[PDB]
Chains A and B, each alone.
Chain A
Amino acid sequence: SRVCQVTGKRPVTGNNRSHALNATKRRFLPNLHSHRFWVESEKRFVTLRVSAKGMRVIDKKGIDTVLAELRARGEKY
C-alpha cells in the first residue's frame, strides 16, 4: 500500500474544486519512492518504501536512528 515506511503517511482524501465551485472526491498522494540506502551498521543496503519528506527527515535525523525506531515499531527489513 502507498504507506511511507518511514512516517506512516498515506493517501488522503479531499476535493477537486472547480471554478463554478463544484466539489469532487479525490486523492492526494505522496511522491513516495522505493529508494535504497547504505548501512555500515548492518553491512547490507536494504531498500524501503519512503515519502517525499520520507527522506528529508532521515537526512536531518540519523539514517540509523530510524531502523531502530522501526525495530521497536515491530517490522522486518
Chain B
Amino acid sequence: MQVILLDKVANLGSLGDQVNVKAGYARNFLVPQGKAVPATKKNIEFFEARRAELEAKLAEVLAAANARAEKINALETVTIASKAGDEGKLFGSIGTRDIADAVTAAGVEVAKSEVRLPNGVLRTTGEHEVSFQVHSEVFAKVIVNVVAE
C-alpha cells in the first residue's frame, strides 16, 4: 500500500516517503491517529506541490540573504570610534549593541542578534574580523577598525 507518512515511525517514516506496506498498522490504527494519510493518486502529488512549493520559494530565499552577507563584503572595513587609553586599552567597550547602529548607518541595516563575535568584545583596539549568522552556512568576513579618538 502507498499510504504516505508524517512523523518518524520505527525504521523509517522519513517524513514524506511513499511505501509498500500492509493494511494493518495503517487504516486499523496508525492512520487512525495522525501519522500517515491515504496515499491516493491525489495526495501522492498534493505534497509534491509542497515539495515543489516550499522548495524553490522559502529555500533559495537564503540567497535573498547570502548576498547581504556580500553587501557586507563590498565594504570590508568599517570604523567605530570610542575613547582609548594610550597604547590601545580603550576604557569601556565595543558593544555587540553599538556595532549594530555602527553598520545600521553604513548601509547593511542590522539589529543586535545576528552579530556573531569571538570573545566578549571589545576592549583592545585596531583590527578585528567578524563572522556572522545572517542565516546558516556562508558566513560573512567583516572587519572593524576601531579608532581611539
Residues of A within 8 A of B (CB): 37-38, 40, 45, 55, 59-64
Q: Using CB atoms, name the residue of chain A closest to B29.
A: A38
By a CB distance below 8 angstroms, the chain A residues around B1 are 59
Q: Using a Cβ–Cβ cut-off of 8 Å, how many residues does chain B contribute to the interface with A?
A: 10
| B34 contacts partner chain A, Cβ-Cβ < 8 Å | yes
Listed A/B pairs (23) with beta-carbon separation below 8 Å? A37-B27, A37-B32, A38-B31, A38-B32, A38-B33, A40-B34, A45-B32, A55-B23, A55-B27, A59-B1, A59-B23, A59-B27, A59-B38, A60-B40, A61-B38, A61-B40, A62-B38, A62-B40, A62-B42, A63-B27, A63-B31, A63-B38, A64-B38
Count of chain A to chain B residue pairs whose CB atoms are closer than 8 Å in the complex: 23
* CA A60 to CA B34, docked complex, whole Å: 18
Residues of B within 8 A of A (CB): 1, 23, 27, 31-34, 38, 40, 42
Q: Using CB atoms, name the residue of chain A closest to B28.
A: A35
By a CB distance below 8 angstroms, the chain A residues around B40 are 60-62
* CA A40 to CA B32, docked complex, whole Å: 8
* CA A37 to CA B34, docked complex, whole Å: 12
| Closest chain B CB from A30 CB (angstroms) | 17
By a CB distance below 8 angstroms, the chain A residues around B33 are 38
| Closest chain B CB from A19 CB (angstroms) | 38
By a CB distance below 8 angstroms, the chain A residues around B38 are 59, 61-64
* CA A37 to CA B23, docked complex, whole Å: 13
* CA A59 to CA B23, docked complex, whole Å: 8
| Closest chain B CB from A39 CB (angstroms) | 9
By a CB distance below 8 angstroms, the chain B residues around A64 are 38
Given contacts A37-B27, A59-B1, A59-B27, 11 further A-B contacts (CB under 8 A): A37-B32, A38-B31, A38-B32, A40-B34, A59-B23, A60-B40, A61-B38, A61-B40, A62-B38, A63-B27, A63-B38
